[PDB]
Design a protein around this ligand. Structure first.
Ligand code: CA
Ligand code: CA
Length: 227
């Protein structure tokens, strides 16, 4: 393989996710667990809002809640920054602007701890409207396919990304969420700095009929493209 970290993804890998959030002073925690199969770009996760009712819609947290599981095609293996940063991992930071509403600011560390890929995140949301699409829970429980556009940031030894999520609203409108992303390695080992490309990202949301807690089951399928 072209990076040592890529070797950690040839099988099925257990995933743990932990998020601490505060949106307009509404504090919440989310815990997720599942597994990823990067050979196929697939992962399966179940998330619980452990603090009670989630005060924002689940779809607004999908991008925040492990792009190391993307499938890079064989001719694109030299462009996979994410796996190359493993096991020590990377910091992923975003600002997410919900058009005509508030924003999320997130900082996460994605790294291996033993056999498990862990994504630990802090989220702060501000300036949301209490009767808007987010705090009013007006988003449909569904998700569109989107391209994540990646470029190298050679002075941070990392990458940048930007993309625009389109969230369907229950009355037929759309809520746009403009994402700005930066990733930086945690360790000092060499990483792969990619040519421009994108991640073709599909997400499917569902429920577990036996889970009484507020929760989201998420299936993702992601493949790199564009070289
Ligand atoms: Ca597509
Ligand atoms: Ca596609």
């Amino acid at each position: 393989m072209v990076s040592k970290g890529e070797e950690l993804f040839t099988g099925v890998v257990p995933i743990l996710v932990e998020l601490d959030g505060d949106v307009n002073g509404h504090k919440f925690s989310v815990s997720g667990e599942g597994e990823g199969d990067a050979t196929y770009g697939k992962l399966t996760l179940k998330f619980i809002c452990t603090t009670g009712k989630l005060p924002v819609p689940w779809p607004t947290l999908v991008t925040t809640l492990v792009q190391c599981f993307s499938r890079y095609p064989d001719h694109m293996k030299q462009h996979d920054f994410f796996k190359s940063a493993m096991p020590e991992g990377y910091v992923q930071e975003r600002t997410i602007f919900f058009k005509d509403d508030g924003n999320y600011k997130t900082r996460a560390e994605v790294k291996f701890e033993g056999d498990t890929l862990v994504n630990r995140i802090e989220l702060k949301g501000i300036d949301f409207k209490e009767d808007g699409n987010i705090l009013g829970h007006k988003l449909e429980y569904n998700y569109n396919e989107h391209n994540v556009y990646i470029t190298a940031d050679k002075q941070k030894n990392g990458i940048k990304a930007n993309f625009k999520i389109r969230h369907n609203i229950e009355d037929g409108s759309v809520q746009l969420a403009d994402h700005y992303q930066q990733n930086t390695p945690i360790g000092d080992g060499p990483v792969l700095l990619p040519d421009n490309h994108y991640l073709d990202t599909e997400s499917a949301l569902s429920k577990d009929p036996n889970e009484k807690r507020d929760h989201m089951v998420l299936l993702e399928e992601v493949e790199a493209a564009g070289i």
